[PDB]
Structure formats: C-alpha cells, structure tokens
Design a protein around this ligand. Structure first.
Ligand code: NA
Length: 164
C-alpha cells in the first residue's frame, strides 16, 4: 500500500464530471474543479487543467496526471504551513500518508486548524489523537473514510486499506 493507492481507494476514479460528497464539481481521482454551482465554470476549469477541449470527459491517464499533481500539491501545502510541517516531520512514512490524505480531502487550512489533534499526533499519543480526530465534521460527514485514515494514525499500519 502507498499514498497513491490509498487515495485511489478513498477518492475513486470517474472519467466524467461528477459532484463530490459536498456537492462540488469534480473529476478523476477526487480532482475538485470548482465550488461554483455553474457546470459551465467547471467545464472551463477542466479544459484549462487538461489543456484541451474535453467536453467534460477525460481519460484514465489524464485523471492519473491530475492526481500526480494533486498529491504533490497536498505535500507542498503541508511543507509550507507552519502548523502542519512540524507534525509531518515528526511522523513515520505511513502516518505521513494519513496526513497527506486529510490535506488532499479538506485542504491545508482546514487541517492546520485542528490544534488539539495535531498536538496529540506530534506527541505520539495515538489513541488520544484518534479519539480527538473523530470529534469533527469530517468524521461525521465521511465516517467510513475518516475511520480508515484515523486507524492509519492510530496504528501506523495500512491495516484499514487491506480488503480494498
Ligand atoms: Na465515508
């Protein structure tokens, strides 16, 4: 298991524009296009992102290319955020993937505001961090995904991604 496979499980793969769990136009492996309610706006974002007139449909290779960029962007956002970087640097490679996963889903600013969970992770108080992470809109709105990510933080293993 690795970060690409883990996010592929959590995000799925769809080749036509769809609405994510929050109702926002998305494509590929969880590539958010826009928060605008305008499908036309989403279509401009998509054509700009891919570099051609897509008419709302992309190939698997194109989806994987956006995904490569989006994983990089999540790592970069962690490294450039003064609250996230020390936590990331303190973590092992598997738990780093759990943090990248959170940032991919909700953005650097949102994750960076969880000062109690971040402190517990930095302190390596894994059970306490796991309990604290579940007291979130994130957990309530996407509980099965959040449970997998939380198990990854709690155990430092990929066990939650094994039957998928
Ligand atoms: Na879920």
């Amino acid at each position: 298991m690795n970060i690409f496979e883990m996010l592929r499980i959590d995000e799925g793969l769809r080749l036509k524009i769809y609405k994510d769990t929050e109702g926002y136009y998305t494509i590929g492996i969880g590539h958010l296009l826009t928060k605008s309610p305008s499908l036309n706006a989403a279509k401009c974002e998509l054509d700009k992102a891919i570099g051609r007139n897509t008419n709302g449909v992309i190939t698997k290779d194109e989806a994987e290319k956006l995904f490569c960029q989006d994983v990089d962007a999540a790592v970069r956002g962690i490294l450039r955020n003064a609250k996230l970087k020390p936590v990331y640097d303190s973590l092992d490679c598997v738990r780093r993937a759990a943090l990248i996963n959170m940032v991919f889903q909700m953005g650097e600013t949102g994750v960076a505001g969880f000062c109690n969970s971040l402190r517990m992770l930095q302190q390596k108080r894994w059970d306490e961090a796991a309990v604290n992470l579940a007291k979130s809109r994130w957990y309530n709105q996407t509980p099965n995904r959040a449970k997998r990510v939380i198990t990854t933080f709690r155990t430092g293993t990929w066990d939650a991604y094994k039957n998928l």
